[PDB]
């Protein structure tokens, strides 16, 4: 029940700031020219991009290449993951390695500081499914939740 | 009657048609691939595409067949098959008041010998199969578009062809002419997905593969 979210408060036409700083509708050409000029003038580490949460993968690589060509390696993300040590270098450091389907095989699960019921409802459903038949034992390290 | 709604079934006609199917199969084993009689007493002979001229001629000239009227000649396009085009001949014998079906197969770029020599009625029919589907019939007196407009690009009855086509017509005053433009419908054809997800007929249940 979130498809209605894609019917309200949408951005349809490009907006630019006018002489009062008020957002006004403009053609794609004007806004793209403004952004292109600002990218051309300011270069180096003064250029940055904070990728969102619902973005795709194609746009991420496009933005990464665009900001790399202006020598900007300040591509950040809203979420914070510990970059100390291996960080993103090793994939298994930031992956649910044994897959969602593997939950139905494990015998002991230790969830640390998580509420999978809301953070990942299908993952919690899989944990419950394994809990029913396989008699898997759960242990929580975070705050008590339902 | 015990079956006031079920259509009556005739078995004598079934036996006669099966006997004639075996007769035709024995007469021309070179081309007759498979013969079958439907439940509603219609006999179909599936032949190799090379047997178009011979088999028809036999069915037209044999004393025991005497099929001297090409009722209908058509094609059915099944994209999932290798040779998608499936040419169908419907013949009627006025002496034995019986209808027969001779069905052959052919892909997009394989020619079929024109049956105009045997059935002179086929001359127009063949053109239609050429125009609607694209099956080229060699040794034809004149192959041309028969239904589509002049300069049409494509074969409309092919499954891989939109029912609205690609080009619509209009009158342009700038050129004072009936010009052709890319198709653009005011209301798109609403494609209805009406198909029950529950198996209808247990008899025609394809075995799993």
């Amino acid at each position: 029940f979130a498809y209605d979210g894609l019917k309200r408060q949408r951005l349809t036409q490009p907006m630019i700031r006018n002489e009062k700083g008020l957002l006004t509708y403009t053609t794609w050409e004007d806004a793209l020219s403004r952004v292109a000029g600002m990218l051309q003038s300011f270069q180096g580490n003064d250029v940055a991009a904070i990728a969102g949460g619902l973005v795709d993968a194609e746009a991420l690589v496009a933005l990464k290449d665009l900001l790399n060509r202006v020598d900007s390696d300040s591509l950040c993300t809203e979420e914070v993951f510990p970059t100390a040590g291996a960080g993103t270098d090793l994939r298994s450091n930031y992956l649910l390695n044994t897959t969602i389907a593997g939950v139905e095989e494990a015998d002991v699960i230790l969830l640390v500081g998580t509420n999978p019921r809301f953070e990942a409802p299908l993952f919690n459903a899989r944990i419950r499914k394994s809990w029913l038949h396989n008699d898997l034992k759960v242990a929580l390290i975070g705050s008590p939740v339902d | 009657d015990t079956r006031p709604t079920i259509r009556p079934r005739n078995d004598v006609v079934h036996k006669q048609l099966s006997a004639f199917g075996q007769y035709v199969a024995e007469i021309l084993p070179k081309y007759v691939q498979q013969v079958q009689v439907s439940c509603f007493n219609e006999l179909e002979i599936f032949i190799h595409p090379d047997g178009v001229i011979p088999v028809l001629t036999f069915l037209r000239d044999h004393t025991n067949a005497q099929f001297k009227s090409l009722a209908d000649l058509t094609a059915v396009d099944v994209p999932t098959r290798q040779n998608r085009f499936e040419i169908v001949y419907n013949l009627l014998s006025l002496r034995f008041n019986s209808q027969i079906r001779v069905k052959t197969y052919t892909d997009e770029l394989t020619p079929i010998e024109s049956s105009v020599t045997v059935y002179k009625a086929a001359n127009w029919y063949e053109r239609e199969i050429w125009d609607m589907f694209g099956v080229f019939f060699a040794n034809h007196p004149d192959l041309r578009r028969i239904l589509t407009g002049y300069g049409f690009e494509g074969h409309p009855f092919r499954k891989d062809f939109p029912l609205s086509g690609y080009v619509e017509l209009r009158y342009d005053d700038e050129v004072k002419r009936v010009v052709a433009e890319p198709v653009e419908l005011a209301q798109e054809f609403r494609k209805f997905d009406l198909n029950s997800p529950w198996e209808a007929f247990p008899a025609y249940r394809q075995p799993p593969e």
């Binding site: 029913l132 | 999932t80 997009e108 609205s164």
Partner: protein, 129 residues
Amino acid sequence: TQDTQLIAVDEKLDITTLTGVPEEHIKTRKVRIFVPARNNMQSGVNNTKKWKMEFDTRERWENPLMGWSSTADPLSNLVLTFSTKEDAVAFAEKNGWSFDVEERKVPKPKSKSYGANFSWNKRTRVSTK
């Protein structure tokens, strides 16, 4: 087989010039070979036994007069059916259409047992009927 000086035409079959499809609608489109998923509203699988080929959805605007779903994509409501994946991809390559075939998902065979509803040691024992 066919004794008419039967010629080797090894190079792959292509009727892109024999279909009448315009320039635009033959490479910028992307067909999709897939087995349709069962409608989760229902519980019948008779619609998940034939492969289907379809074309990417394009612009669908509103008619200014009445508000219809006007479109300019002829290959929008055209969906082909195929008995097997290989035949569907053969059709896609034959007509020169870019594809991306998805494998056929199959429901994994479960293990049902009425007795488990009334188990004595396990947690599958139901609390209601």
